[PDB]
Design a protein around this nucleic acid. Sequence first.
DNA 1: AGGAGGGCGAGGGCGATGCCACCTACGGCAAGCTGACCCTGAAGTTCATCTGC
Length: 116
Amino acid sequence: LPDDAGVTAVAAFLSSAEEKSKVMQAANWAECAKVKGCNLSFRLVDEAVDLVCQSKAVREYVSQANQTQSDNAQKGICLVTGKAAPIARLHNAVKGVNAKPAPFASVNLSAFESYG
DNA sequence: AGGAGGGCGAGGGCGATGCCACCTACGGCAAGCTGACCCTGAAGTTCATCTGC
């Protein structure tokens, strides 16, 4: 995804090792270090509300990286909709129930698995 | 000797058996603590172990 100026910016910020060091020397960095599992994200300036992961190329990339990579998986068949719709192992971490986002529907122990 | 030993009918009548108020005051009915430990997870990989080579 080149010529974005949002990800070329961060890819030039993630090939820096010093500006990232400058992130620790920020006014409020001491308050993000307090929260375990802080989630930083990359809003390039000159978009002003829009993250690097909000530009209409990363937006399309994700809409392309959730339409190509998450479509070659196990071909069928949906429990929910019944369509072919490639099957999703690893249901996504439903947040707000547990102490951590937990996979609402998740059969992961040696025998909760039914038929192998 | 042969006596007669009461006969009668009354034995309450009248009303009153309570009046008055009071039957509580006061305040407190809790304090203090705890109400749970412990684990049990998805997901993934490692790592010890097994089978086969």
